[PDB]
């Protein structure tokens, strides 16, 4: 079924795969995170509750005074969003925390607290997030792009050592914690394990273990197993382990069990090992010389006198063997030595171990962290414990613990956030195992190890920083705390937390000014996954293993969409269906597959879980039961792809477009497109300016609807019903009766947004797209936003194009454009600038904004007002004064006679220099609004009072009219109730609306309801009065500004650019182009029946830079407009429904295999006529990205119109009137107008304003700057013989004031001549050197 707004225009859809999981609510990653941050969590596992209970409780050292946290609440914001945009403050709200402080007596720790107190104390102010996932922080929407970073946990990374010219692999383990100090280990080239806590001076890896209080024997036992030995006659017998003999050769004749198992020189083959095990061959005689190569396991001490014969980790010499034999040491147990499988690299580390004392290792760490400090036992122990063990300075967060436990194959999923002995021990174990050929390594660019940090986590992090700081302050005060003489306001301080959090949401690299020049730009810039930011990979330190695309991005990150240039592949986007797992790893949905039945139930899989199973690609067909029609269905596996059997499939994709992002799934026919050009097309679409009148794209993808609805700027309804009263600035919706509240419904008052500036100078204008009285269903589109059209997103506009190389003007990639496209003015934006003029108070009196200005003609003052501010609607131009501002004539100059004058005061009527802010050169405009802002204690002047009264009167009108409309709804409800009971018509309509309860009504609930409504009416009166007073107060009170400013007046210029011969239009498949000429309507080439063509692109951009998608788009657009022309012809003849209904039904069928299956039979022919009216200039066609529309369908669709099947038509040449041979393509490629506008690019310069200290011409487009003559151009001139031009680019046009003036004189005087002579810079340098005692003389 189709709602009213949907029924306005059904988009023909070519899709085939039945959707099972519709597109989710975009921006979910943002709203879910932030609601997680602020929402009162009773369990308090995440959010502000978690941070508070982490930092709390508090108490000074032996203070007998404990500060505890009770609860937290987020009060209402002081302002609301719209006035926040107007004013400039953050859209923040207070954060009131209920705290409790209790203090005991002396020698009563456990005794009852002597005194208590509790208060809802103010605890900082926190920014909030609007309904679009944006933050209004300084009169502008800042979006906190979520970041991507290496997850906390342990990552045994090989770290392939391409250095050393040896190929050796320096296996590296890195226990990265979420909060604390790192801890990594690596094998050095000498096969010795080393540690460098926090990347400071490397230390032997053993050190921490012997700093962990582990004895050398304990260290050896933990790292190494042992081999038992026994002195038994000559050639002491040792426990034979045939398993240990694996990967070893018989260094001696193995003749045990009366059998020659292995003669000397032969390996111990599997045959011999099996024979040994079968006979249970065990401890046997072995040579002592063979044992000589072993290493002593324990610390053998001569028992006769208790003298250390030898500590462990020493090789066995026969003298030592005899010595221990005489002492009675029957046991000669040695560490099991090997290299193939049990390489004891840590034994070599122990050999390199400089010391063994625990305190010695503590001192080693103490010097390691803080070099050169005085060694100390207590401080060293505290350092060693607090680096890892102490919770406060180290915390593997729950994500970190989970990853760490899973990496070490622990049975457990949850544990403490601090490490332990066994943790590092097992890390070392697996590290040596990997180096010993037991275990592969992880790759950090596998999304299982990458993690997605949203806004909420970042806010919690910064707020926890603030909490620990204020807690430190609290402890400071408590240690000096007085006895119950101050409640928790002196101990507390809101300033640090507020400063920290506003520093984050404001000045941070992840709070970018929202990209608002299109709805798609907004939504893409929200759903963004950046690899930069704190604790991340800086855009130059990152290499290439991360700028690449890993084979798990599929379903979690769009390969196509990413900015190019400096940082390519660091700023990946998010798939359309992607989510964030509870830990924060990018999951994705898959269709559960039980046997052949692909069950429509959906399961969300993380990154690692994907590999464990085998998945089918989305466009694998089915047979109405979920069974794969092709039994050996293509499927993907642990980074692989093969034809798996019909039963060897555990999951299937949800839809044909979960690999891409919305920023690139809007592309149609994306399948028939190279990845490079699709990437550039997605980047282009993201920055398309919203033209004057939105135009529904003629070839969409079915994703434009959802993108526009969920982006935020479409004024989506809230409750269904009827549209009581449309308007250009407001829509009022009478609610449907069922959806009405228990009382006082019938009111929506959707305040549309008339013209206002965007964050890139593009009008954000919302227009109403509902006819009066039309019913509306919930969640529909009442008012089109900027670049929206009945809900559908409309970025650019259609334009009938003809791929043919015209006379050159489309040479490289240029684009003709017939005058018609600019004549009918379909590309024309409404850029709205914001010039801000301020009035500071510097030395020598304040700045004056008076209209009185010296040295200005009457023309400038003609349009100003008396105060000095231009009137609204003043068609200003270049150079006109917007604001009349002046300064008090410099400073203290001349001589002490000037000080005498100042004592007497000067004698100047003017006594003020001109500093008025004019229109920037080269821009027209019609002033819309001029806001005035006043520092408190500054009396509002004439213009300020004018605006103040205007806004106050308008606000009075607004409150009055909303109250009136709500009262009208209330009385309509009263009348509806009075239809039954008290229905006296004459008595009802005789008396006025003063009393509609005195009418007769028996004992019924109706009169009780009327009494409730009357209470609502009186409450409405009182609430209206209070809102009115509050609004008056807010308007009247002066707004605090930056220091030293009396008042600032900001004026919003509005301009109407036009498509012109330097812009940069671009299709959607990356096919850029700069408009090269605006031809007359005639010179364009016109098809057979007269209609010209509005663009002539260059064909030779197709075959190379292969993006043949756009040709398919052109053809399908041609067919779309063909059906449109057919419907237009039928309507112009005023055909009778049957013709229309039949034709539209046929066009919508076109369904060899499709999913539309629409029917216009039950369509209320009036609505069929409305549909024809909305389709009479095109039949919109959808084409999901990879379940596209095949060519044969396009041929049939064109054939439905009378147009030729080829997609090509003969075009006549307008200028001559002959025929182009070689018939040419003509279709409707939906072209954009990217906001690289020529008149924001061009910037001339002859002798404009110069610089401050460099004294060169001032650089920058914002200040009339000339192109920079960098070094490489200096080389370019040197290569040529041209020298004078270089010598003049360096001296007579950079800094030489005398040379500049002389050259200007010569030019105006008519002489073309530089002045030969060394530039004065040489003279300055010469005197500089002569300052030093250096001759630095000249020569010949």
């Amino acid at each position: 079924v189709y709602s009213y707004t949907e029924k306005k225009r059904i988009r023909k859809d070519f899709g085939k795969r039945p959707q099972v999981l519709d597109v989710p609510y975009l921006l979910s990653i943002q709203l879910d995170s932030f609601q997680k941050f602020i929402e009162q969590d009773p369990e308090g596992q995440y959010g502000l509750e978690a941070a508070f209970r982490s930092v709390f409780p508090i108490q000074s050292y032996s203070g007998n005074s404990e500060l505890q946290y009770v609860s937290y609440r987020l009060g209402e914001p002081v302002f609301d969003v719209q006035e926040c945009q107007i004013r400039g403050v953050t859209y923040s709200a207070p954060l009131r925390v209920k705290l409790r402080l209790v203090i005991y007596e002396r020698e009563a720790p456990e005794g009852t607290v002597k005194d208590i107190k509790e208060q809802e104390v103010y605890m900082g102010e926190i920014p909030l997030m609007t309904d679009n996932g944006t933050f209004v922080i300084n009169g502008t929407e800042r979006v906190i792009v979520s970041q991507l970073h290496r997850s906390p946990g342990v990552f045994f990374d090989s770290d392939k050592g391409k250095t050393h010219s040896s190929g050796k692999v320096l296996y590296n383990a890195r226990i990265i914690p979420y909060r604390g100090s790192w801890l990594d280990f690596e094998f050095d080239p000498k096969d010795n394990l080393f540690v460098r806590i926090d990347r400071r001076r490397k230390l032997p890896a053993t050190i921490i273990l012997r700093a962990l209080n582990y004895t050398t024997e304990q260290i050896l036992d933990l790292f190494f197993e042992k081999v038992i030995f026994e002195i038994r006659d000559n050639k002491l017998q040792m426990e034979l382990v045939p398993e240990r003999l694996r990967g070893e050769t018989a260094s001696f004749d193995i003749e045990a069990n009366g059998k020659v198992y292995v003669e000397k020189g032969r390996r111990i083959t599997a045959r011999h090992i099996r024979q040994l095990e079968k006979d249970d061959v065990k401890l046997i005689e072995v040579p002592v010389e063979y044992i000589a190569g072993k290493v002593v396991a324990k610390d053998y001490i001569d028992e006769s006198t208790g003298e250390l014969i030898c500590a462990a980790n020493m090789e066995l010499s026969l003298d030592l063997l005899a010595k221990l034999s005489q002492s009675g040491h029957k046991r000669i147990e040695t560490l099991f030595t090997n290299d193939l499988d049990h390489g004891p690299y840590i034994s070599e580390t122990l050999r390199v171990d400089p010391t063994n004392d625990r305190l010695s290792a503590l001192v080693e760490i103490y010097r390691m962290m803080r070099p050169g400090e005085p060694p100390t036992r207590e401080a060293a122990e505290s350092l060693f414990e607090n680096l890892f063990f102490s919770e406060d300075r180290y915390d593997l967060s729950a994500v970190g613990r989970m990853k760490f436990n899973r990496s070490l194959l622990r049975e457990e999923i949850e544990g403490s956030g601090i490490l332990s002995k066994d943790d590092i021990i097992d890390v070392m174990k697996k590290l040596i195992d990997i180096r010993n050929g037991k275990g592969e390594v992880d790759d950090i660019d596998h999304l299982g190890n990458r993690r997605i940090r949203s806004v909420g986590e970042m806010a919690e992090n910064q707020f926890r920083v603030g909490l620990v700081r204020v807690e430190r302050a609290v402890k400071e005060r408590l240690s000096l705390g007085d006895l119950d003489t101050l409640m928790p306001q002196d101990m507390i301080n809101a300033k640090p937390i507020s400063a920290a959090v506003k520093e984050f949401f404001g000045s941070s690299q992840l709070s970018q000014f929202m990209d608002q020049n299109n709805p798609l730009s907004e939504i893409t810039h929200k759903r963004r996954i950046s690899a930069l930011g704190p604790g991340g990979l800086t855009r130059e330190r990152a290499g290439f293993e991360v700028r690449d695309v890993h084979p798990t991005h599929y379903g979690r990150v769009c390969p196509i969409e990413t900015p190019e240039g400096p940082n390519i592949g660091l700023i990946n986007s998010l798939s359309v269906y992607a989510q964030t797992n509870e830990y924060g790893f990018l999951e994705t949905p898959y269709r559960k597959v039980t046997d052949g039945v692909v069950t429509d139930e959906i399961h969300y899989l993380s990154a690692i879980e994907e590999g464990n199973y085998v998945i089918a690609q989305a466009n694998s067909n089915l047979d109405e039961e979920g069974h794969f029609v092709e039994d050996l269905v293509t499927c993907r596996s642990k980074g692989e792809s093969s034809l798996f059997s019909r039963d060897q499939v555990d999951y299937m994709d949800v839809s044909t477009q979960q690999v891409v992002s919305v920023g690139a799934s809007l592309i149609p026919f994306l399948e028939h497109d190279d990845a490079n050009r699709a990437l550039m097309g997605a980047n282009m679409q993201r920055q398309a300016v919203p033209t004057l009148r939105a135009d529904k794209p003629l070839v969409g993808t079915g994703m434009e609807r959802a993108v526009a609805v969920d982006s935020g700027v479409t004024a989506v309804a809230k409750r269904g019903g009827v549209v009581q009263y449309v308007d250009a600035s407001r829509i009022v919706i009478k609610v449907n009766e069922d959806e009405m509240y228990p009382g006082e419904a019938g009111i929506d008052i959707y305040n549309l947004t008339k013209y206002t500036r965007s964050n890139q100078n593009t009008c954000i204008n919302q227009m109403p797209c509902v006819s009066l009285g039309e019913p509306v269903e919930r969640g529909d589109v009442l008012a089109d936003g900027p670049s929206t059209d009945l809900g559908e997103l409309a970025l650019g506009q259609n334009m009938r194009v003809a791929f043919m190389p015209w006379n050159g003007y489309n040479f490289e990639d240029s684009i003709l454009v017939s005058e018609r496209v600019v004549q009918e003015d379909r590309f024309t934006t409404i850029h709205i600038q914001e010039l801000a003029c301020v009035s500071r108070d510097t030395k020598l009196g304040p700045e004056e904004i008076t209209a009185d200005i010296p040295n200005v003609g009457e023309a400038a003052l003609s349009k100003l007002d008396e105060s000095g501010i231009v009137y609204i609607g003043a068609e200003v131009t270049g150079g006109d004064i917007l604001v009349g501002k002046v300064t008090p004539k410099g400073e203290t100059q001349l001589t002490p006679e000037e000080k005498l004058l100042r004592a007497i005061f000067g004698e100047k009527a003017s006594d003020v220099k001109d500093s008025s802010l004019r229109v920037p050169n080269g821009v027209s405009g019609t002033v819309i609004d001029v806001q005035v802002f006043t520092r408190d204690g500054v009396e509002k002047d004439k213009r300020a009072l004018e605006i103040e009264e205007m806004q106050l009167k308008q606000a009075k009108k607004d409150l009055s009219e909303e109250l009136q409309i709500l009262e009208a709804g209330l009385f309509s409800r009263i009348r509806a109730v009075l239809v039954a009971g008290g229905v006296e018509a004459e008595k009802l309509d005789k008396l006025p609306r003063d009393r509609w309860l005195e009418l007769g009504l028996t004992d019924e609930e109706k009169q009780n309801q009327l009494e409730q409504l009357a209470e609502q009416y009186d409450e409405l009166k009182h609430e209206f009065e209070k809102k009115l007073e509050a609004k008056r107060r807010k308007i009247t009170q002066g707004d605090d500004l930056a220091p030293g400013v009396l008042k600032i007046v900001k004026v919003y210029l509005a301009v109407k650019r036009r498509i012109q011969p330097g812009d940069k239009m671009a299709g959607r498949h990356g096919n850029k182009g700069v408009i090269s000429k605006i031809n007359p309507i005639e010179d364009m080439p016109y098809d057979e029946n007269g209609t010209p063509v509005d663009i002539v692109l260059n064909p030779l951009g197709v075959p190379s830079r292969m993006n043949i998608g756009q040709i398919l788009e052109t053809h399908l657009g041609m067919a779309a407009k063909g059906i449109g022309d057919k419907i237009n012809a039928m309507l112009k003849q005023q055909q009778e429904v049957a013709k229309l209904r039949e034709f539209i039904q046929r066009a919508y069928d076109l369904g060899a295999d499709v999913r539309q299956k629409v029917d216009l039979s039950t369509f209320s022919d009036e609505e069929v006529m409305r549909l024809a009216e909305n389709l009479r200039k095109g039949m919109p066609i959808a084409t999901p990205v990879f379940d596209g529309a095949k060519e044969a369908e396009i041929k049939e669709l064109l054939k439905l119109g009378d147009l030729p099947t080829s997609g090509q038509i003969r075009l006549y040449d307008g200028r001559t009137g002959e025929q182009f041979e070689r018939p040419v393509t003509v279709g409707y490629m939906y072209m954009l107008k990217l906001n690289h506008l020529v008149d924001d690019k061009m910037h001339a310069r002859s002798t404009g304003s110069y610089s401050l200290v460099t004294q060169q011409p001032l650089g920058g487009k914002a200040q009339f700057g000339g192109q920079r003559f960098g070094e490489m151009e200096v080389w370019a001139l040197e290569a040529y013989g041209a020298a004078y031009t270089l010598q003049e680019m360096l001296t007579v046009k950079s800094d030489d004031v005398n040379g500049r003036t002389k050259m200007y004189k010569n030019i105006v005087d008519g002489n073309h001549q530089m002045e030969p002579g060394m530039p004065e810079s040489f003279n300055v340098l010469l005197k500089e050197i002569r300052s030093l005692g250096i001759n630095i003389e000249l020569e010949d």
Partner: protein
């Protein structure tokens, strides 16, 4: 004061915001000559402002200077006339953003357009490398009269047909002009106007314009060629020669000296550059500029009148594609089954799989290239016969307009086996051209190679930048300061043999460079050319006819000079042709030539094959 960025030693090197500057987006400029740069009005009344003041106050239209200022700011009609007068001949310097080459600061004359976009002649879009998709060029001006003469003599866009590094021209028809030329001259077996003898070229153009004879029409005409057979004399010979009507039409643009056969083929991007270069060598410079203008114009016009447009139906797919792919699939199936049995190890199985995929890819590529090319069977007024096709994709590829055989293969044939992100070649290739659709798996695979290419280019940008900087740092010292060092120790150049694959003959690597010892013919006691002689093209031809396998050439690697390098010992400048005149710096010529072409740089028994 003598240290750091503000140190007054390294101060004129950091960068200076030069006055009289400019900027704009760029726009194509056909109808311009090859030495004209369409400059906007709104930017040419703020560049030549002081010049306007001078010519205005001098003319007396407004004697006082402030009146002149207020007149120009008043847009009075006279100021347009005065500005036209001052910019009558006042060369401007158009500079692209990264100025690797020494052509990247070429200078043009101005012609004023309306609007705001620095037009730019199409042919000179190559040296700049601009692409008219948002590229922005800066306009400087030379003030002092010496600087004007430099901008007109040393840098004018019409005195740099030959780039510094490689001798051959860098004003070479590029994208649409070559497609137009290609279309304008192609042999069609039978078409309107077939089988007739018209006249010289004039009646050929008359026939085409009237529509009587189609553009492609194998027909005999009477072109007369003025060949320089005699010593510096235009010897004229005329005769009934076969050609095409379009070929006769194009012949009118060729200047006198060239022989007719220079344009009788189907002019691609190769033969057209060869024609332009031959015109250079035979009739000097200025005729080459006139001929480049004419070729660009008569290429654009007939490209338009052709209307070569890329309909989708012209990317023909082989009907044998699916059969070949099924055969390859069966092959990999048998190989995999055999590997499962253990008869072949995993590595051998994988190598065999990729090899048979490569073989199938070759088969499909040959099939599609055969369907695109030829394949046009048409009656010749008798029976049928086949001719090279006119499909717009194939027409482009054969012409070399933009897109060689590889890319059209990717458009119609299998698009290959995309290597995994590491670099190892994927076992299962992409078996779907672009005309048919890709699949989520296949497209997601292609993104790997695409993004790796993009990132590697982005890095190689700065790599080539650093390399150029080092080179110009160690080369800027030199300057050709000695006419002749009078040495004898020049290296002996020979054709370079790449292990049995001699590529560069003695032609190039001794072209122009001055011989040290007198070239001796292989015949004994037969001095071919004297000692200190310039090896221009005719002497090179003499070397070819004598086929000298080794000649001693003076080399700058060892010239007896104190602080420079001999003029003779350097050779030709390889930007103008004649021996390098005293002064022109070669170090910052060299460094940049060995620089700029850096980003293009990618980041048992012998069988005798010849008679000898």
């Amino acid at each position: 004061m003598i240290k750091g960025k503000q140190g007054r030693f390294r101060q004129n090197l950091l960068g200076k915001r030069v006055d009289y500057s400019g900027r704009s987006v760029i726009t194509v400029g056909p109808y311009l000559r090859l030495h004209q740069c369409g400059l906007p009005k709104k930017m040419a009344l703020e560049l030549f402002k002081p010049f306007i003041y001078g010519k205005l106050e001098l003319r007396g239209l407004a004697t006082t200077i402030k009146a002149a200022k207020k007149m120009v700011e008043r847009e009075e009609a006279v100021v347009w006339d005065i500005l036209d007068e001052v910019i009558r001949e006042h060369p401007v310097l158009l500079n692209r953003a990264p100025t690797l080459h020494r052509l990247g600061i070429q200078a043009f004359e101005p012609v004023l357009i309306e609007g705001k976009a620095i037009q730019l002649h199409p042919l000179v879009c190559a040296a700049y490398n601009a692409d008219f998709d948002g590229d922005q060029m800066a306009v400087h001006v030379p003030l002092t009269l010496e600087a004007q003469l430099e901008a007109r003599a040393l840098m004018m866009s019409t005195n740099n047909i030959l780039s510094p590094a490689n001798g051959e021209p860098i004003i070479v028809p590029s994208q649409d002009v070559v497609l137009g030329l290609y279309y304008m001259t192609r042999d069609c077996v039978n078409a309107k106007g077939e089988g007739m003898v018209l006249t010289g070229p004039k009646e050929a153009e008359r026939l085409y314009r009237s529509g009587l004879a189609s553009l492609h029409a194998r027909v005999k005409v009477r072109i007369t060629e003025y060949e320089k057979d005699a010593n510096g004399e235009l010897v004229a010979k005329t005769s009934l020669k076969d050609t095409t009507v379009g070929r006769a039409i194009l012949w009118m643009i060729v200047p006198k000296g060239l022989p007719y056969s220079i344009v009788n083929q189907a002019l691609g991007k190769k033969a057209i550059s060869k024609m332009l270069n031959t015109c250079y060598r035979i009739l000097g410079l200025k005729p080459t500029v006139i001929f480049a203008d004419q070729i660009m114009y008569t290429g654009f016009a007939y490209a338009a009148r052709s209307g070569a447009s890329v309909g989708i139906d012209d990317m023909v797919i082989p009907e044998k594609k699916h059969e070949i792919i099924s055969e390859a699939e069966a092959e990999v199936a048998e190989i995999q089954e055999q590997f499962q049995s253990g008869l072949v190890t995993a590595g051998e199985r994988y190598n065999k799989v990729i090899d048979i995929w490569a073989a199938a890819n070759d088969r499909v590529s040959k099939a599609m290239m055969d369907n695109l090319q030829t394949e046009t069977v048409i009656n010749r007024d008798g029976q049928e016969e086949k001719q090279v096709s006119f499909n717009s994709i194939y027409m482009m590829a054969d012409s070399g307009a933009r897109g060689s055989a590889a890319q059209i293969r990717q458009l119609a044939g299998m698009r290959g086996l995309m290597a995994k992100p590491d670099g190892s070649i994927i076992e299962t290739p992409i078996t779907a051209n672009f005309r048919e659709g890709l699949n989520v798996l296949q497209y997601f695979i292609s993104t790997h190679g695409a993004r790796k290419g993009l990132a590697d280019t982005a890095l190689k940008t700065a790599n080539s930048g650093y390399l150029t900087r080092r080179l110009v740092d160690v080369a800027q010292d030199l300057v050709v300061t000695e006419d002749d060092c009078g040495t004898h120790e020049g290296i002996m150049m020979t054709p370079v043999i790449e292990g049995g694959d001699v590529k560069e003959p003695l032609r190039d690597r001794v072209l122009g460079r001055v011989t040290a010892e007198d070239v001796l013919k292989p015949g004994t006691a037969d001095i071919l050319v004297p000692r200190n002689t310039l090896l221009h093209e005719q002497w090179c031809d003499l070397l070819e006819e004598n086929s000298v396998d080794a000649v001693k050439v003076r080399s700058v690697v060892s010239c007896d000079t104190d602080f420079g390098v001999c003029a003779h010992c350097y050779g030709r400048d390889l930007a103008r042709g004649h021996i390098i005149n005293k002064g022109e710096a070669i170090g910052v010529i060299a460094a940049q030539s060995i620089g700029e072409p850096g980003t293009q740089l990618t980041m048992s028994s012998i069988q005798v094959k010849n008679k000898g």
